[model samples]
Target: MLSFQYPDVYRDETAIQDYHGHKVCDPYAWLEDPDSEQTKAFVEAQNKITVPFLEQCPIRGLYKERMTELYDYPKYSCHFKKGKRYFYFYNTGLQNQRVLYVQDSLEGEARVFLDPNILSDDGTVALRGYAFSEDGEYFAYGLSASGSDWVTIKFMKVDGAKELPDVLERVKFSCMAWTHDGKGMFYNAYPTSTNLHQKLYYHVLGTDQSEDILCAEFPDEPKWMGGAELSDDGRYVLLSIREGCDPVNRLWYCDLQQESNGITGILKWVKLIDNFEGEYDYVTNEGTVFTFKTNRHSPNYRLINIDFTDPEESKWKVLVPEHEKDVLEWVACVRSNFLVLCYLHDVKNTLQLHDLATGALLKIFPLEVGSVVGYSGQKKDTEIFYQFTSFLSPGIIYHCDLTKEELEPRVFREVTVKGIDASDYQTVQIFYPSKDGTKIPMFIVHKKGIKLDGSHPAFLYGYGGFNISITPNYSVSRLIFVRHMGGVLAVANIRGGGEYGETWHKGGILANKQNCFDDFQCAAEYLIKEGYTSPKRLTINGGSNGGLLVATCANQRPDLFGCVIAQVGVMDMLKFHKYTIGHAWTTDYGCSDSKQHFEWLIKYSPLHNVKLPEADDIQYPSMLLLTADHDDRVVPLHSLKFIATLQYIVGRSRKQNNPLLIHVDTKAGAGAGKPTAKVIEEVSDMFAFIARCLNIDWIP
Candidate 1:
């Protein structure tokens, strides 16, 4: 049996004392000084633990082989036609990028198209988001070496003769679609002004430099907006507009030819659905078939179809309606007759095929080991490919044929992890009722034959915001830790998550944010009642938005767990809007300055809700607050300041045992596009923390 010891509180006083002077007091401080030696040490420890754990884990070989055989990493997005082929772009692991690869679909051969490296030797290169004309003779691409702030638009011809010349130069563009006749391209752009707001613009091919033709702009103050697409016939432009402060979105249409100067034309703006909040609304080629997700009917949102011809008079007809206990995630549309959907019965994502015209459920496809990472093609004749992985599995790709009405999936690649037997463990789904009668989805995975006695150590994880769904995916490192210790691992699909669609997400966001905490609390109660583990043996985990979920839960009911791990979490909800990406989240979390919203936010804001622990309050759980110094997305100061305040207050309060520990990892941030080596280490440290707190055998 593996044994562990906690660092002596008095012995570590030197490290603790060092934090006093540089203690983070303000959330914005992270943007100024994100790196700290103390933070690096914490993350390095996690890395040390993870690297070895993953190497020894039985499933390692399976993951390696699966990833290698099933799919190839660094794969660029490709679109092909009879004679023309376009490769979107490629990243060279540095600031430099290249758009040199192009090919003809008929020959399946590729050659250097344009080498931007030839022009500038300063590590700058061209970026590509391409659109080809209907006739395939003309191609359009946008170039931007600078961050998303500015872009230069260009067009080229792909005839059998000489290469085409640049048509447009230094014209701002965000996303574009070509016109049928190849005469012009429709795109969206934001003004270079400090106050940014998106506007529609068009560039006619072969025309000399001229002032941009403006399509539309928000009537209110400068607000971020997007999702602009032109109709196939080039008659109308459909777009979604939203204010930075408001959660509601308005869908509008504008005629392409009727406008005088582009700004003076009157647009027919109409609000699609009232009392409904969601994102990514789009229009399909099928007349009047606008597809979007909404939570208007139930807490879990369902996919619906509306006609644009008369959106106001047209009641939304259900394309895919919600089941009372199930959640549906909108997949892609395969042609106009079929729509793909992922059904989350609990936390597991299962793919399903739905008929657009009849609203009929055709078939269900179940993946054996991993979740669906990517899928393409059309329904009935669609060729589907998926990347699958699990806690004990790496990643493997499989191709499935749906032409015969039955899925005969062929294994394109199987990750071979040497010495690992994934069958030794099992995954189970559990539903727990919250304090307010909302049912929360919880996923539990454990080593086979582990007794379900209250003595077994366990880890509970959650992330409940941004309409993001927490579904089953392979994490070989996490599974190894649990298996090594004969422990239980659980993920709670709490509210404020897209697991149940829009309705379920809204129930736990903004004013209804308390629902997220309550749902997590209910999950803990269920674990205890189900004989998996007790508060003394429980440890909770979450990161980013999930970090907020776990932290709030630990504060609200401290007795439910022995330790809590929050990684790059948003603890200071009241002041989040002042940071980089925080502005984008205001749609889910209301502005904290508003009196009405403040009252709701104050009720669960982890940083603000901290107070003297009540005598009756169970001992405050030991905590490890992890954050990255360079996380521009969610400033690390949110974690730093919260930890500083919690350490000062919780340390002074009377508690039974276990010191409140705040761990900050300077090298990691938000966990998006992180290095594999770094992620492994973080997971390992998390496991070690839980094992030490619960006194579990690390090498059982």
Candidate 2:
């Protein structure tokens, strides 16, 4: 529909490798070096072409204006208690970052505890991991720059908001927990040489990070990642060791109070659940019997009791049996002896309070069609807090008091956008059949009473890997598309996600990864056949693994979608494990080192599968490849190589006119902890690109 001059990129034809008798050509290998002069120039040249094209959209300003207006709403998080003080995060409309606030009581005066926006001029420095000592005497938080995984942790005293002298560096994928005595804390860190091997360390309050004592290290299992936390009783330090992104983990613990030397060196360790036979999440404990939520024998998950005194396979007893249809999502101990369990039935969420000792269902908390974002409480906490959000609602924090005779969830805070009415929109969920006859669930949302004559534009999104459930959550971009352009938003609950549990995740990973692409393609076809949209009006989008989803789907069925948006995807399947933390993804995407896995990956790897459109009617869709310069998660090199290959093989053809472009931003990571202003700009540019390519105009 549109034509433009594309950038000419230099490709090294000699940059190739042989994989299991397969000659894999990697012509753009030089792009992998992110900081080189040539790579920087390549980024500049590509953005120069993409920026001017997106800026020419007549209604781009309207998108940014309305996006900012709706995004400028005060948001509040659930209250989490640190010692006796209540703390929560609040964003004042357009604040770049959410500010942490502390109060003495429910109705007490709330004062600013920490403001991340003040740490950076442009709000690139965002808050990451954070923890408070058991006594609430000290608070430790991690700061990440430009959305990088690398973090710097600092400490402060809670009283009078006094800053401390402790600073820990070179931390990634770590968990922090303070000792009961408040003398020191535990954290995981990786060596600067290789971000692979992780070691557990204990840092004394006043000591330097270099002097921190190493508690444990898995030298033999270099790919294994570890996290540390204290048992709820505060008498033991529990260690959860994981090899990759899989839910299963090895559980280990050490009795802190029984140690005479007091963490001088590596203490005696007990391997409780030493194998990856099942995924175990520690819930709470009595004197010796510890409870955990596990998916060992039950695909939907169940609770079990393991007594440290006996500690045998035969001695393990089931506390709560697995549900036939619903998946046990999470468990929290509250009111000293009560258990709160969050379950996922279909795609929505339900909360239930059960008897901790007997595992008897006590009460069911009624909820609307939405997802429970998070909950905050402890065994000693009589009052619990949780946050919920849906397709239309932004956020609602609920407080439940166990001591009240009429126990129910009361809205603590509800966020409202400026000019949007909930009554004007409607959401519906439909289950469609995949290629293999698998019933896949999908959620569709749009303005009420809209005509569905296959004329409206539809955006279908999916992320079908890493056991991440694509649940119902509020997104300003999706709502804007529906409100401003009469667009339809559809989220496909495809395989490879934990939507149905570990079984569903297994159905879409490793050798079965093709199921993810097929599921997504079937979702697009269903939308079109249902008169929701036509192939010329459909846009497919995903990020990370979902990035791989859209990229592969577009290649496999180029005629099915009008536009494609792949954000920071893993394009080069052969060498992904060679990068930082990319090895962890081997759980879902099988490692290329194996011959069988190489066969599976090479079949659908985006970089290797680019095919030139043969006829004028079969050209590729208008595409935008998105990534950030500082994104160390899925490196920008993926998008770089794929775009170069696409342009070289297809964009130069006489019949191809759909734009193939990549947009790289500086001082940004994958997608975590991004500033609000940056988010607004990125989302606006995305919609502008989609609007221009689809020939749609802003409603207002």
Candidate 3:
């Protein structure tokens, strides 16, 4: 591992903070500027150094070609119905983007309704999200270019399929909901890229955005995120408000029937469930009786029904009681006969069909232990489609017709990854104890006959915050490591996830954030101790909150692993609350504004804790820090600053000849809208980097 002439990073020594009488130096403070000429120049120089080294990988071309060949396969999504037509997104082998197809009937001949590939030659542009009118006469879709969160929504009509004149822009973290009559749409967007005030509005079919009705806003509390959900009956608009990433939200609604009669044209607000004691959602409604999923008392969650006649807590009636083991993640309100309930037993999904009238579970859709990736249906849809996959299998959409006596999952379309044979590999779930004696679930995957030899290079991945469960899912990149490098892959279902319910989430957030690091550390140790791999042959990876996981663990115990891959990480926790929607993450990562929380944050915040390897040591793990130019979610500055800090600090004292590199995805915005080729390119380079770091020669 050769060292290069590192980019010069200046330290603003005066940029110091007094947090609860504790002051620390923040050297790379100026890098926070997104548009500073100095910052742009620094980014340009840094990318030159990192990019050149990664490109110099002797087998980079082979790795990229193999990844593309392994990735080229027909992929189809779950189906939904609109206007007597069933629609789903599909991508033929090696397409840059998925093509949305629609059929007159479920089994009818399908035709391309929308092809995003034609939007751009490079496929950098992507469809961010979409919403169809109830009657399917009109549709609104969100499109974003170069991976930016900023989206421009375009409209299309199905009555002979004509492009509409209406287009909405500046949309981010917004949902598009069409009115029942299909005449207007309710949506929201940020005023600017960095602006936090996410406001709600209504757009009529042919009207310009200037005339779009302002439905709601919370100027006093910019952190209070707002989303609108219309009742199935189309009588009410449920406005959900939350201050951070926490599931708990304040629920309020306005009757559309009386909205026109109100003074401001906005409906008269009814604060029924206005307290954010816990998470709550309006599942569906039957005239006056509305069903909701809430965890007000039960940590695992339960469903209850409340009528408009007496919509009060004391007046609530339990419909589906909380299970002691399984969590009622969501319930799908289909038609008259069955209430489709989705539960998370451990981390994987389980579907149950309950008699809507009795609230009793009629039958469970028997599924192998894996993941239910997609689910969609409506009252008019006879069959609802879902997709499930595991490390050893590709995704296969499973659909069941409610019209049948018992809903059994039947295969619809199977997704493949070219020539890979899943039967040659195996995935197993096992429990490993953390430092606190808490059992952490992890899934280990590898070639079935691979010996448990400490010589094998292992890749351990984790994301342990914001109630984000790192569950089982097939990955083309991870498979490439196992199949090509003869390595093993593992995903730790650690604390700070929705795995065990709200309790699991609380155990790894805020002051308890260190528990996340501990759980992940113990996971790597488990692999080494079990003879699966040695510290010098082990690599750890995580993104966003999980990125903080690897970075912190690398700082805390650098001797524990050989490589660290931290991607789009929230590094500078002290200033994380200041960026776009960064304030929303305060619940998971307590704000540094307060005295007690600031002290807690500085302990594990990736930037603050990074230093010369361990107890006054210079040995550091091979590090690959990844971030994008337009990623406002975690922001590039977090990685930009932290990388400069580590490279400067570690570059001066690095005792070992281990590589330290950074991959800046300059063209892409955030994490969501990346195109197919970009994804392949990034993963190929990173995985190839892993092979080089671990010294695993590619087989083919």
Candidate 4:
């Protein structure tokens, strides 16, 4: 067994006593607390170290050159024409703003056609949800103001000169699609109501505002519905309507030629398919190709495709089927031939291209260590651009030519370590056995040529919830910290993550939640058994949901770690429903209103599980709790209350050196949206904390 000392923040008896006396201070008392003077000084000291380090860091220049050299952030939902003559427009980032950028087909140079932000200073600007007419002569756009949710409709002639004409005003519209002749558009709009209930509405370009017809009546409850598109030939208008919680959606068609006056005719709500419960991920080219994920056939989801022209009873053909043990992870679709699929074989993401027509596996990109971050669409006949990186390597853009079956390396960026060689780092994959006899995957990365002496320190990181996959991606900050400290960085792929698929996710949620914690424990134990590091020299860290994981482990197995770091964690699951955006997460974690749910949550809720001083008998690990006040996503009060409660309980009970430090960054918290300078400073503070607690010296 290894022995370690706790930091002053966690061990000083006088500081702990003073913190209790100041518990009833102001709402933001932590920021101005005189007792937390050391914590405050630590942050300032971190800023001093971080600012200079970041200024000299080589990785900063690469992001600036690559992003600035390529192009500006393009407006969303705007498609580039193949011929590249005219650019279409749709959604804009700023509230109620819109613009069309005209580009030359040959040179690819672009100039803004319109900037709606300049047109209105009162916050009323052009709207989102737009579509171009089939003939490409007329374009329709939506408009809304800062405080308003309703979007007004407008149209313009794009042939020779731009002329604005009001189609409809003060109406709500969604999923805009145009008719073939450029005379009318198909759209869905709910009537102005206090509650959000969407319906289908159709607007004729030249017709009076009062003449617009309400073709479909949507459910009053919150359900998904969209008036998608009229077929390229302009014969049928395709629409998707779904109801109920986790509703099953089906496509319907209506005749476009029935009404000459441009009013929507008798609607034929035909069910094109059934058992499709998930969201329609995307629809392509006039509704000819539709791609979505459904769990109708297997517990894990499979990407399925359907053709609108087929009969209503036609079955959806499976584009990418589920593997026996692996899940077919559906990524975005590229062009018509290839669909990107992430195959999670033993928790490592292997990118593969699948043929859309025959569902045949086409090509597999060889990735030995790094993960795929960006993949570009096929250019012309043969070339595809792919960006790949890992923990040690900075991102590099590679151009692969399909015709030649060759890859050309384009060195876009590289992280330069002053005294470290790229070949001196080793990334090892290990599977550890869990309490349930299941194997949990973990990635251990460390300096190469280092002997397996039990003296080295290690850091374990994990997040096992919310259907998110903990992928192997590049991080310059982690590389610097681990390399400089002579420590090993380990990433654990535990249960409740989407690494395997929906079934893997379901395995760790709600009733089966303990599996996630057990998996983490297994990974840590495995590292210790393999002589990578002993318990007293190991540091565990995680953020958000993973924050909860670290806290839980610290409280449950206090002797198993030297220190623990929890950032913006949901400590009190029982009370999360009372805070902002907490209601939205009930889909992932069950609402605690029910008795069964309440009992299950109470068993693992970090705040509620804080053991009394007498119960533990042993000393807990040194802990640093980080919180941001502006974190509207997860309430910062949870951290404040948990620290206060822990201080009261741990101080009276523990005999050993158990230090608890609480650091709250007032300017930032949950999504602080801080500038580059502040972020660099924060990173520096975190590194300093880890170095100080682990008793490691700064390399410089």
Candidate 5:
């Protein structure tokens, strides 16, 4: 049996607050400070217990080896065209970071354009985002250190990859766009403070950061964020302002053709969509006519055109009307006169081509039950590239010739794993009932010939907030579980996701937030009741918003799972908005500043709802909480305080034989741009923990 002696943690009983005459105690509030010596000591002590427990698993080494082997495969990004050159990101098997490559033609020889691995010794620094000049003369990219959200923008000449002297600092939540002249560009940054009030600044090439011209600022609304997108014709700089995470944004435009003095200062501004009414995504434009994909009146979204001269809601013309069943996920103007529309139909992705000028369907691209993971196209190009993948397949990049009278998609590149055939696995989608009888979609994958004996170990994953869909994507850890451990993998497309569009998202947020937890628990129940696995063999996992999902579910039903993994979750819901960019989440998670909101949050907030197990068989799940030192997105404090509370309340019981551990990683964030080695190491540790807790041995 696995034994645990949790470290003694300090609690400040004085940390109490009154929310609408309701007193709430926060005993572990002292753990919220990352820089405090006390918090550092707590993290070190917790790791001391965790590292040794994971090391005791004899199968951990083999899991790491097998995971590393599966991960040692070439990966490619969808190649896009920029100034007559094709650029794409590629990793030649197990490299720490993907290398950027540029080629003269689609079939031409490719060479290294920029390698992020060379930026740091341990590959802790990542290429956050990048953009090229109109003529491809200059390349501006953002780099973040130690996985921090803070980014520093740098410039380099495209021809020789020569580094430029210009650097933009204190940039976060930014968008960069270059001018047609290639003399300068516009990007958003917090010039005065790193945490608030982002301003769009125009930087002329070869100019110092202090001399950058301010294009726009929202002094009155510090929380309002800004971004920029240049039209395909390079005639207008479509500036967008968003106040929260919701899809709605206020739009404004500045015509470059009117700037006769070469962007010396704020040229002019025109008000278009000046309210947070709906999402207006600028696709392509013809002279003064702008096209956008919006959810204005259509919850599932549609494409519409608006003339700049008569920009009114009444004058808007629908290019593609909303579909009754499917959600129009995205739109791209391609082949000069065509609009490529991708829709989410029954949790699977489907693509169709439409005439840009008229709301007429042209042709539907043939596709399988998978996701369009990558897409690259332009209005001037007669060809486009898109990548597809699913739970069983690795990935396939397709090249479609739009000029062909009979359109057909040809395989450009195929990514594969060594010694593994996708045919050996099976994937199926099913709908199950939640607590309210609302049907939720879920995907289950396992070996084809596996029997439903109610003995196999199962992994259930979910992310139920942020209007993001939990689409089918390839994962090394998932494959390792099913192929090597005789395990079952499941992903629940619960409420709060955009799978069914705006109505679905609205169903799992605020007062409805409990629906996410209820739906996930019901998923576990379905998995077990169907003879796939029981409570002793089922493990639940999630990260970020999904992290909150798993934690809340585990708290609500401690006997439902064998193990739990919550990564960088917003455990302290009442105070989540106080941290970096956490305020933007208020659109989904209501703030505790109001009495009514506090009442709803206090009911299910993970940190506030930790309960001691009432019976011997109802012990807490074997828990592994993952967080990083540089995670400014959700902040490490959430996981820190959460573990401290759980240990203090539940781990102190004699019936709680389940081990509780926290893995605090350095130089990492909320799992974006993570180095390849780090990802493999984390997955290896995760599976090892599950194996030890569930008493499942590795088959290989």
Candidate 6:
């Protein structure tokens, strides 16, 4: 066995602190200062060391060329409607940023509405939010730079795509909505220094941001995040606040008539739904009644109509009852009281048109048993568009014209990459049993005629937190692995996701969080036990919450796999809640501030769980800790602290062949607006790293 050299890092045992009733030691606390001179120098050194190992790999250049060849393709977003114009975002092959395009009619010649490619030479600046006025004369967008969540809102004229001087700052986690009259807009923002004290501000056109009105706030609870939207008629400002990342939220309304009379009387808000009982989405409104998609009573979710005039829970009318099997995901209201509802049947997406007034299923569209990731249309429009894709399909834009006698989804555009034929691949789903007898769903993809063989390499992916479902989605990089590395790609739809509704999510959260690991562990074991792959040829991958999944599992079972790729994972479970927006995650991971929660986290926290290989007979897998310079979401400190500890314990082990390394992608905002060039470059480096550790060479 060969041993690889690893970097030396500082250990500050004095950085120990008490959490609740327990004492926790964070040795790499110095890395938390992202702007510090030492942190910068350390990152520089880490990147320098990573380059030689990756650059010198035998298959590095081949992987880079192949990845680029597979990645260069034209892509587009589903077209949406604002006023009379229909618009969508388009990216020519290999462009840094997608360009927003608009058309006077559905078939009209499309022209550039806004091009974000020119925002920066390397695509560091991203268009985060864009909202058009009701009359379509103006549009406001939010831009974030270097992957930072902090955004600046800018306005533009729609007719000529000209920029306006109005700018709003101190904004992060915003939902911009234009007033019906186009005089002002509602937006959510956080303070400049930290992502705390969220507030809703109303900005009038042509006015300075400092003069914006403080329309709504929960001054008592800084953890509350609120979003503001105007009633379609512009009469009321609907405000909704969530305690955390939970789907449940508190709802309120402020009448503009009361605002005009505030000088004469006291201005007050009317509490609509005052408790965080369950999730509610304000769909559309009628006179005094509002339509909402909620999961208040049903785990699968339902659509209901509530009138504020008669406001009472018992008086709420169910527009659509919950399904016995499929979970309702989203509803699009249009063409009078008709609606287009999307459901998840075994993690495959299906769509149905329903009579909103009678709750009758009118038509069930024949879907590809995949995912509908994008859609666009309004109540006034007779046509709708949706983009669908799966493991083998890149993308197929479907056009549904409701005005016709019958409904059929016609393919408007089909996305295909050069030198690729999707028909050559196949995907199959199976239900696998977890450690404690709970069944978890998993999807596997590979060449159509490939047989189950232990010699092939395997790539297992998962994200088992935050009720975020892992569905069948297309990936160019995964295809490279399957076609080039003889890889069997798999995705486990484990608990802690919305795959099976609220119960499934709850099953893997809080104290039950261990269920996620057990489920994923069962997946890897099943793959090896089934002769699809062996432990030596398996690699696990995840990012963000998923990052925590692979890293923690790798520590828990050192001999399970050959490699790991943890991208921006939440490593220090004890200190994670102290950072930006980290508090919101308590809905999934209970706060370590509580003694009971501390016990739960301390047991599996990646930083606290690291140890040398369990026995001399087996070795620790080589792991890649990937983070970004501007990753304010999950700071690089998590990776920095984690890698420092890993090297400390297992760095000199001669039995290990894994590459223990960290790569910091610079100016790449937390997985958003990253340029095509950067994505290909990074994925190629990763492919090279995986090949180097697995001792595999690339083929044509």
Cα lDDT tens digits, model 4, 255-331, are 65555655555466555553344544442322455556655555456776766666432566776776777655545
lDDT of 5 by residue, 1-700 (tens): 6465778887788988988898988888777678788888988898888988887877789899988888888899999988878899999879888999999997899999999999888777899889899887789999988777789999999887899999999888789899887878888888501277889899999989999998888898988887888999989999888988998999999888888876777658897889998999998999999999999998899999999999878998888899897999999999899999999998899988888999688988877898999999888878889999988768989889898898888899997756567788889999999989999999999888878889899999999988899899988778889887889999999999999999999999988998988999999999999888999899999999888999998899999999999888889998888888888898998999998899889899999999986775788999999888557788888899899888888988778888878998854453678888888878888998998888787887
Q: Specify the poorest-scoring 10-residue window by lDDT in model 1.
A: 1-10
- Displacement of residue 291 (Cα, Å) in model 1 is 5.2
Off by over 4 Å in 1: 1-214, 232-235, 243-248, 255-280, 287-307, 315-325, 366-370, 378-382, 386-411, 416-419, 616-619, 652-670, 691-696
- Per-candidate local distance difference test: 0.61, 0.89, 0.82, 0.61, 0.88, 0.83
Assess the local accuracy of residue 178 in candidate 1 as a C-alpha lDDT between 0 and 100: 66
The parts of candidate 5 lying over 4 Å away from their true place are 2-4, 192-194, 667-670
Model 2: pairs clashing at backbone N, Cα or C within 3 Å: none
Candidate 6 structure quality by residue, lDDT tens digits, 597-677: 988999889989988876888877878888886577887788988887887777666665566788887654547667787
TM-score of each: 0.72, 0.98, 0.97, 0.68, 0.98, 0.97
Cα error, residue 419 of model 5, in Å, equals 2.6
Candidate 1, residue 30: lDDT: 30
Q: Residue 267 in candidate 2 has what lDDT?
A: 63
- Mark the 10 consecutive residues where model 4 has the least summed lDDT: 17-26
Kindly list the per-residue Cα lDDT of model 3 for residues 1-700, writing each as its tens digit: 6757777778899998787788988989888886898788888888887777777777677778878888887788888888777788888867888999988987699988988889988787899889988888888999988777778999999765689999998787787898887778888877713476789888888989888888888898876677888898888888888777788988888888886643244557787777779787887888888888888898899988888779867998899999997878888877654678888887888888786666898878877788888888765556678888877667888888777765566888886655778888888888999999999999898888877779888999999988777767878878888888878899999899989988999999988999999999999999999988899889999998889899999889889989999989889989888887787788988889988899889898889877775555547888998887667677888998898888788866747567777877767453776678887878877777777777788876
Which candidate gets the maximum lDDT versus the true structure? 2
Which residue pairs collide in model 4, if any?
10-659, 10-660, 11-659, 127-142, 127-143, 628-669
Clashes of each: 20, 0, 1, 6, 0, 1
Candidate 5 minimal-lDDT segment of 10 residues:
188-197
Candidate 3: residue 313 lDDT (0-100): 76
Q: Which lDDT value does model 5 have at 72?
A: 87
Q: How displaced is residue 405 in candidate 1, in Å?
A: 8.5
Better of 1 and 3 by TM-score: 3
Candidate 2 residues 274-358, lDDT tens each? 9988888999999788999999988899999999999997999899999998899999999888999999999999999999999
